[PDB]
Design a protein around this ligand. Structure first.
Ligand SMILES: *[C@@H]1O[C@H](CO)[C@@H](O[C@@H]2O[C@H](CO)[C@@H](O)[C@H](O)[C@H]2NC(C)=O)[C@H](O)[C@H]1NC(C)=O
Ligand SMILES: *[C@@H]1O[C@H](CO)[C@@H](O[C@@H]2O[C@H](CO)[C@@H](O)[C@H](O)[C@H]2NC(C)=O)[C@H](O)[C@H]1NC(C)=O
Ligand SMILES: *[C@@H]1O[C@H](CO)[C@@H](O[C@@H]2O[C@H](CO)[C@@H](O)[C@H](O)[C@H]2NC(C)=O)[C@H](O)[C@H]1NC(C)=O
Ligand SMILES: *[C@@H]1O[C@H](CO)[C@@H](O[C@@H]2O[C@H](CO)[C@@H](O)[C@H](O)[C@H]2NC(C)=O)[C@H](O)[C@H]1NC(C)=O
Ligand SMILES: *[C@@H]1O[C@H](CO)[C@@H](O[C@@H]2O[C@H](CO)[C@@H](O)[C@H](O)[C@H]2NC(C)=O)[C@H](O)[C@H]1NC(C)=O
Ligand SMILES: *[C@@H]1O[C@H](CO)[C@@H](O[C@@H]2O[C@H](CO)[C@@H](O)[C@H](O)[C@H]2NC(C)=O)[C@H](O)[C@H]1NC(C)=O
Ligand SMILES: *[C@@H]1O[C@H](CO)[C@@H](O[C@@H]2O[C@H](CO)[C@@H](O)[C@H](O)[C@H]2NC(C)=O)[C@H](O)[C@H]1NC(C)=O
Ligand SMILES: *[C@@H]1O[C@H](CO)[C@@H](O)[C@H](O)[C@H]1NC(C)=O
Ligand SMILES: *[C@@H]1O[C@H](CO)[C@@H](O)[C@H](O)[C@H]1NC(C)=O
Ligand SMILES: *[C@@H]1O[C@H](CO)[C@@H](O)[C@H](O)[C@H]1NC(C)=O
Lengths: 64, 407, 94, 98, 49
């Protein structure tokens, strides 16, 4: 639900609005379905999860 | 016909360039804009076909294209490179452009300056990428280009000392490495001063980014103000028409509002489509500029700044990208006398990579973009033909290195 | 007409001609040096030698065929005006 | 697999390329075109909102963009250079273009 | 009003096309006149001088 507070309609509240049916996780994966404001939805396993998209693998160049 | 001018010094100058990449994503709803939640208006509008489906489809397309533009402009890296904790770049100072942990959203100083410089059926969709993530892309690009040159733009990033990277760039712009290696401190000081000047100028310019925001706000305000026009009817309020008349003649006063509001909405959608096309062209140009000036060195004239392009830095903006083009500008020229080739022992000698210059008595060989005279030998020249066909030949000796050392 | 107005361009035609003449003079005299900063004079033959050096041809070829190159260039320039005396792309907009 | 061709001569060719850069800047008075200076028509047109304002804004934007295009295309030089009175260009003749 | 709106829309589209052409012309000037271009068939047919 876009730009709607979750009290006006398991249940997760994001900047893009209120999201129902997705489980918020602490992981960070690549974006499968773009939700908005840095949030994406994917189907892991059997269920739907909502996370923060990961920009990419971290890398530090051995510079001297 | 026998005079040339060659610079003896140079100045490192950094200039800015601002390109809009995206605009605000907006969506509208007919059933609440034209009708304002009234059943009879929807019943009458149902007779008009499926214009509103087309309008919604167009708005959705132009909203998706904005995220597509942002992704193609900024997401040009695979890894997220990080600057090493120790920063020893041969005297160069990137403190004003590198991310600051204490600053909000981990933005840089110049990024913070740039960011500080600048209902009823209408909704605004937030962008897919937030400001923090765009700033992280910019920081990754900056770290990669600082610590790897252009190698990371073609595959795995390969580390290299920064002084050697700038020596590579100098060689690319036609100046030998010894010129850079013997002037490292001066180049670093000039670069630092030029960087500070950009900060000073910005702290005191972003018209192109302001223009799109102003145009979008003006269009939305005009669309909202169009709701208070009767279009030659009794009033601009649906409820006034409803609860003052029965519906055999009130239905005639309603359709006029319907067609007026539909015309206004179609005009707004067409203007938005044209503006989105122009923004897409600008975003394509910005992506090309990023790929050709940041991930590499461009030989195109006046494409990555004014002068001989060395290397560029990107910076995030509210709805755009700011480039810091570092260019090589020659200065302090003195003009000499010149000959196309030298005749010696009946043979014409041409310079391998430079030109023949004379200060009045002696002849030398120097590179074209920097004054550095050398003694004319057989190692920096090649022989072709005899000295009776080329016009402008002068008489001089060519120093053969082998003869004196052998004897 | 009835409410139609044609605004005059800001840059008058002789001003554009002056820009073009300045560009031609800079190209002929300083080569490409004036495009990056201060104009640096250089004999035209050596600039053309530079330009051949840029396309993978040794500069001695120009210094051995200058007369032929100049004659061919003059003949081509003369042929251009005969070909002109086309502009459909400009006419279409009008 | 063992044959190559190498040129032994060359020709100098000049070709013309033509590109439009600007249009004719036109501005249309919405009220006088629509109504032809009649008060009643203006009064009825006032009921239609601010369409004429948007039309004039678009036309003015186009007119400004034309001058911006011309300035970008041509104003790429800082100083007005002048050719020397002599024409010692190594046998090259630029009389037709100077 | 309908005729005027149609005229304005067509003028806007034509102006966008002309602006694209003018950008191409400016790039061609900067890359063929102020320097030597290595791009194939960008500054004429053959090897640009
Ligand atoms: C090339 O230019 C630089 C700066 O434009 C010159 O360095 C300056 O030298 C003067 C003379 O002592 C100092 O007062 C300035 O502080 C120097 N500037 C900087 C930034 O260090 C340099 O001397 C010039 N080189 C030649 C050969 O003329
Ligand atoms: C790079 O430049 C920055 C300023 O742009 C330097 O940071 C400042 O340095 C001065 C001089 O000691 C300090 O007084 C300030 O507290 C520093 N921080 C600011 C102004 O925010 C930085 O030191 C320079 N880098 C190096 C290696 O010297
Ligand atoms: C290059 O040489 C020319 C030839 O003398 C110099 O041009 C003259 O400079 C003087 C000094 O300002 C002027 O009064 C003359 O009008 C110039 N033109 C002439 C004499 O035709 C020029 O100064 C030299 N370039 C440099 C950088 O010293
Ligand atoms: C032109 O450059 C030559 C470089 O050899 C100069 O000749 C030398 O000048 C120095 C400086 O006075 C003398 O110590 C040497 O004895 C000279 N000869 C040699 C072989 O080095 C010459 O003076 C310069 N001329 C001008 C007008 O600058
Ligand atoms: C360059 O040197 C050659 C030979 O050292 C000069 O050619 C001689 O010129 C004189 C006078 O014109 C003649 O008397 C000789 O017969 C020539 N000898 C040969 C072998 O050609 C030539 O003139 C010199 N060029 C300049 C410009 O001084
Ligand atoms: C290369 O081409 C040029 C011109 O295309 C040739 O020069 C011509 O030679 C013929 C034969 O004598 C003359 O009749 C023409 O007048 C010449 N053209 C010009 C413009 O002068 C040249 O012979 C060819 N071959 C070589 C090796 O240069
Ligand atoms: C440069 O070319 C022009 C023509 O494009 C030459 O002017 C012509 O010269 C011939 C004689 O060579 C005359 O018969 C014509 O009447 C001239 N046409 C004019 C003046 O319009 C000019 O002479 C050439 N320049 C050089 C230095 O040869
Ligand atoms: C949504 O409603 C809750 C409950 O009143 C409130 O605390 C919160 O501020 C509202 N807004 C958001 C964005 O959660
Ligand atoms: C995610 O991590 C936070 C810690 O910042 C924790 O409070 C929260 O319970 C975690 N949620 C899940 C679903 O693991
Ligand atoms: C240069 O021009 C002068 C005329 O001032 C002439 O005497 C000389 O022969 C010319 N030299 C060349 C190489 O063109």
């Amino acid at each position: 639900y876009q730009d709607v507070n979750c009290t006006e309609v398991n249940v997760f509240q994001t900047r893009a609005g209120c999201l129902i049916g997705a489980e918020h996780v602490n992981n960070s994966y690549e974006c499968d379905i773009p939700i908005g404001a840095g949030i994406c939805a994917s189907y892991q396993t059997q269920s739907i999860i909502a996370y923060t998209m990961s920009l990419g693998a971290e890398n530090s160049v051995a510079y001297s | 016909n026998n005079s040339i001018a060659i610079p003896t010094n140079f100045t490192i100058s950094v200039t800015t360039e601002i390109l809009p990449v995206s605009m605000t994503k907006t969506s509208v709803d007919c059933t609440m804009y034209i009708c304002g939640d009234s059943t009879e208006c929807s019943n009458l509008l149902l007779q008009y076909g499926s214009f509103c489906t087309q309008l919604n489809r167009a708005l959705t397309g132009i909203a998706v294209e904005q995220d597509k533009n942002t992704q193609e402009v900024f997401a040009q890296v695979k890894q997220i490179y990080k600057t090493p904790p120790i920063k020893d770049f041969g005297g160069f100072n990137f403190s004003q452009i590198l991310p600051d942990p204490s600053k909000p959203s981990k933005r840089s100083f110049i990024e913070d300056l740039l960011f500080n410089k600048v209902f009823n059926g209408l909704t605004v969709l937030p962008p897919l990428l937030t400001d923090e993530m765009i700033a992280q892309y910019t920081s990754a690009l900056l770290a990669g280009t600082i610590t790897s040159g252009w190698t990371f733009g073609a595959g795995a990033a390969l580390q290299i000392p920064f002084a050697m990277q700038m020596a590579y760039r100098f060689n690319g712009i036609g100046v030998t490495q010894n010129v850079l290696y013997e002037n490292q401190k001066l180049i670093a000081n000039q670069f630092n001063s030029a960087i500070g000047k950009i900060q000073d100028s910005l702290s005191s310019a972003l018209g192109k980014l302001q223009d799109v925001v102003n145009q979008n706000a003006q269009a939305l305000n005009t669309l909202v103000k169009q709701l208070s026009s009767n279009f030659g009817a009794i009033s601009s309020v649906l409820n006034d028409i409803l609860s003052r008349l029965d519906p055999p003649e009130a239905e005639v006063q309603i359709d006029r509002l319907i067609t007026g509001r539909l015309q206004s909405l179609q005009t707004y959608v067409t203007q938005q489509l044209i503006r989105a096309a122009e923004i897409r062209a600008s975003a394509n140009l910005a992506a090309t500029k990023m790929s050709e000036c940041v991930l590499g060195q461009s030989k195109r004239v006046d494409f990555c700044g004014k002068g001989y392009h060395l290397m560029s830095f990107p910076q995030s903006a509210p709805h755009g990208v700011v480039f810091l083009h570092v260019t090589y500008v020659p200065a302090q020229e003195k003009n000499f006398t010149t000959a196309p080739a030298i005749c010696h022992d009946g043979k014409a000698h041409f310079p391998r990579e430079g030109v023949f210059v004379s200060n009045g008595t002696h002849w030398f060989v120097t590179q074209r973009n920097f004054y550095e005279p050398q003694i004319i030998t057989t190692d920096n020249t090649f022989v072709s033909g005899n000295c009776d066909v080329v016009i402008g030949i002068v008489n001089n000796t060519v120093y053969d290195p082998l003869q004196p050392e052998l004897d």
